[PDB]
Amino acid sequence: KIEAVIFDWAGTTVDYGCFAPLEVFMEIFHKRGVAITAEEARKPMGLLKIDHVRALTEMPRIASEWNRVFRQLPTEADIQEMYEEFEEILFAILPRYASPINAVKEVIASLRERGIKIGSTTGYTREMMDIVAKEAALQGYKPDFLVTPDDVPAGRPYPWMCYKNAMELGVYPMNHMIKVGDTVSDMKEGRNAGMWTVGVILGSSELGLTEEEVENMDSVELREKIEVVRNRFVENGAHFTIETMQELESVMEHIEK
Amino acid sequence: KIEAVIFDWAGTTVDYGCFAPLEVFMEIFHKRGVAITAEEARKPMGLLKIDHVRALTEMPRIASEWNRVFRQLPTEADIQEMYEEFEEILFAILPRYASPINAVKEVIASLRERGIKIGSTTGYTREMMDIVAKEAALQGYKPDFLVTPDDVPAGRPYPWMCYKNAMELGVYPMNHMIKVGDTVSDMKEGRNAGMWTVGVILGSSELGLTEEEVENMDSVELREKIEVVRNRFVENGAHFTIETMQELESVMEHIEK
Numbered sequence A, B: 001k002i003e004a005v006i007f008d009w010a011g012t013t014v015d016y017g018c019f020a021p022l023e024v025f026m027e028i029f030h031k032r033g034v035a036i037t038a039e040e041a042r043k044p045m046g047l048l049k050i051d052h053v054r055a056l057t058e059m060p061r062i063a064s065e066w067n068r069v070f071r072q073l074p075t076e077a078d079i080q081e082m083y084e085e086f087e088e089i090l091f092a093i094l095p096r097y098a099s100p101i102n103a104v105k106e107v108i109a110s111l112r113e114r115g116i117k118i119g120s121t122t123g124y125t126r127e128m129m130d131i132v133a134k135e136a137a138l139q140g141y142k143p144d145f146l147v148t149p150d151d152v153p154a155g156r157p158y159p160w161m162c163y164k165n166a167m168e169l170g171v172y173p174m175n176h177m178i179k180v181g182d183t184v185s186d187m188k189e190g191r192n193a194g195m196w197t198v199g200v201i202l203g204s205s206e207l208g209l210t211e212e213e214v215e216n217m218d219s220v221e222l223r224e225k226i227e228v229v230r231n232r233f234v235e236n237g238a239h240f241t242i243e244t245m246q247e248l249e250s251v252m253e254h255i256e257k
């Protein structure tokens, strides 16, 4: 029944915790004397990077500190400058984050043995993907296909990218495919596309923790942050939720019944 | 609640009875000394023309007959040569087969007034569609969008052409879309695409009759023939069947329940 799986990249296939973008946002602001925190930076983490910047700009705590520094509120120009800067720096450090999350690689190898097709979608622009893809391929990960918002009329949560995938992998109907992500948007897109939607937790952009703080965090404390997200997923369309990609082939078996 | 209807072209919105291709398919095989029937000729109607030729040669009755006549089964060269002929003959008559089918236009206008998007797919190439759609426009018919097999990995039954219509019209999930066609391939395309499928009988390729033959036919014999096409459509995936496009609107309403 299930013939292909569509994987997200950031916080799913690579970049444990999806920090690359978070790292950048904090720089462009810190360099301007208006330092923001990982929470409020990740706060918007789901919309157009361009608008993501503007959102941070209108965040009262940030908006006030900006006005304190520049003696004036951000200008549509500032947003446009910070955005240009955001990209340049991102292209710079993207490769340092294109490492396949330890769990994943093996899982992909297993699915491929079951003749199951591997596809993907993303929030990253084609420019950025060329970079992340190239590094991830040297590091052992390379899905059968890949699509970016540049390939379609609009990105997530539209199912456009997912249809492009099915079109290229040659799989139909939509319910013969699973969508695996690490964010609310990943869930929406999955459903909008009429396919089985699942959500990874450990290393998600939702759980927002690094491999470091996960391995060295209070069990009871961590076992609690995991629920705030696993629940968070189901509350958005996740037919299922998994702490790690190690539970993938298991959910498949379930689904196929 | 439905939001868009994807119409096939020949035998659905134009060319009553889908006659344009018919004599061309029979002619190309007749020149090789291998006669075929209208039934055989019409069986794979709806598919990308090149595929349609390949489909005819695949036919046991025809293949055997070909093998018996030439002492070897049909070749790729043969298929390719006949196709070249098929295109020459077709192109010189295509303008004469773009007249909208009678009451279709009134239906479209109604659909638009209800704010419903109009998309379409076909078996004709983009070059063929250029001629057909141009003439169709002049005669009052022009959907919001058009997609040929040239625009995707493959033609019918694959749901690729429908997904592009979804992308363009900005409609999701596929279940919010209805597919209307006049052949078996039309039915399969819709189901594969995960959308409400409807087949139209009078004027369809499956019925294979002219307007004359329809109005001047033994009503008892007519209803009887209607029953075979209908049973056929359903047999092949059709969710509902209608005699004419006038019934469409009603079917939509039933579905919205």
Ligand SMILES: [Mg+2]
Residues within 6 Å of the ligand: A008, A009, A010, A011, A012, A018, A123, A181, A182, A183, A186, A205
């Ligand atoms: Mg992600």
Ligand SMILES: [Mg+2]
Residues within 6 Å of the ligand: B008, B009, B010, B011, B012, B018, B045, B046, B182, B183, B205
């Ligand atoms: Mg047709």
